Amino acid sequence: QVQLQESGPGLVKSSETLSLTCTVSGGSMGGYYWSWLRQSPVKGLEWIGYIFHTGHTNYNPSLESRVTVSVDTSENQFSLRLRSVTAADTAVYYCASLPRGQLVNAFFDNWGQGTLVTVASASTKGPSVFPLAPGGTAALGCLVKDYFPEPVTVSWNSGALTSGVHTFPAVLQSSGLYSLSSVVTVPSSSLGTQTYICNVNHKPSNTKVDKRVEPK
Amino acid sequence: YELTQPPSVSVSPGQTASITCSGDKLGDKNACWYQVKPGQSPVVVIYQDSKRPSGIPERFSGSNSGNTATLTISGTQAMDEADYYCQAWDSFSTFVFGTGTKVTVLGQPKAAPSVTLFPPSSEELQANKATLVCLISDFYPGAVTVAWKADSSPVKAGVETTTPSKQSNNKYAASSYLSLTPEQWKSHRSYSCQVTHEGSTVEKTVAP
Ligand SMILES: [Cl-]
């Protein structure tokens, strides 16, 4: 049986070059095209490129200008270089084997586990915080925009307000920075009465922001 | 370009899951299906339309004709929960993949999402920039589609959407962001967040 396992750096910075390697266990580097693919919510499942042990390559036309696939039969390994990565290149990267034959009947048998690659900001940045103005209830919140890296701690009224607080997981945006929102559901009977202040703590940038949330 | 699959198919244990894959003249090609689980090697569950590799349970069957390839699972088991991708050959890009289908085997009763949509703040607008915030919480299964509308025209730029994440109560949450210029925000009568969960669609709308 032939087994594949990719190795990767985990986290990389935008504009850098991503380098991955697959180690092939069991048989030798013959009879197969050795392929790279990646999976993400935005890219779906997409093929990157493959290589024959003779060095012959074929690439995905949408990725060809940034991609180089190489093989080292002495080490039972093949590799991927992906240049000028941006946050959009965040994905689970797979190595896989492609049997020889007509492309019309070709499919990827044998896959590695996958290696997650996150591409994000090359620098630490503190967030900008904006107010999200509001049955008998209302939702209000705070928008925590453009920070790196995780984590951020959000509390309401220095933590004295806990009921109805829901802080959402961050989105990694295309800029390589994170954004999240914290929202609290409160009685409409409040508003104009009772103050709502979100406290945002981002220790990596030494930043702390307090915002008062009011109805407009 | 891609082959069209439903974003999600949810079944109770034992029900039949049917995943379709649609494309121009797909029936003239051979389709294969990949089962993708997080933390694991993807596996081929079906190749050449209907061939089942050694190792794959008999409950997986495949069909392909016209413009549609269909993966059928019959008596879906919990261990069959995964993302499934259709795949065929393409004359230009060599391989063409389906958009993917999250197959959930229900481990709890369904729950509809609570959706809240926020307009840009005054402060953000004064800093030029503008962000609409759509928060989606307490839904099950953990699969949702979010479409943004400018007035009534679909929005195709500046949408960032998170992968649904499991809350402490075993239900899911997600959020979607629409980035605009201030004039874009002030040019239209309203913006809307359309959240489709399973079959139902709830819409939230805000205006300048
Ligand atoms: Cl569950």
Author numbering:
A (entry chain A): 1 to 82, 82A, 82B, 82C, 83 to 100, 100A, 100B, 100C, ...
B (entry chain B): 2 to 9, 11 to 95, 95A, 96 to 106, 106A, 108 to 209
Which passages does the manuscript contain on this structure?
To aid in crystallization, we added an additional mutation, Y32LN, in the light chain of I32M to create “I33M. Y32LN occurs during affinity maturation of the CH103 lineage and N32L first appears in the VLJL of intermediate antibody I2. We determined the crystal structure of I33M to a resolution of 2.36 Å and compared it to those of the wild-type intermediate I3.2, the CH103 bnAb, and chimeric I3.1 Fabs. As with the chimeric I3.1 and mature CH103 bnAb, N32L in I33M could form the same hydrogen bond with the HCDR3 loop, specifically with N100BH, which is conserved in all members of the lineage.
The CH103 bnAb lineage, derived from patient CH505, produced several bnAbs including CH103, which target the CD4 receptor binding site (CD4bs) of the HIV-1 Env. In the CH505 patient, Env insertion mutations in V5 occurred throughout virus evolution, which reduced the potency of CH103 lineage bnAb precursors through steric interference.
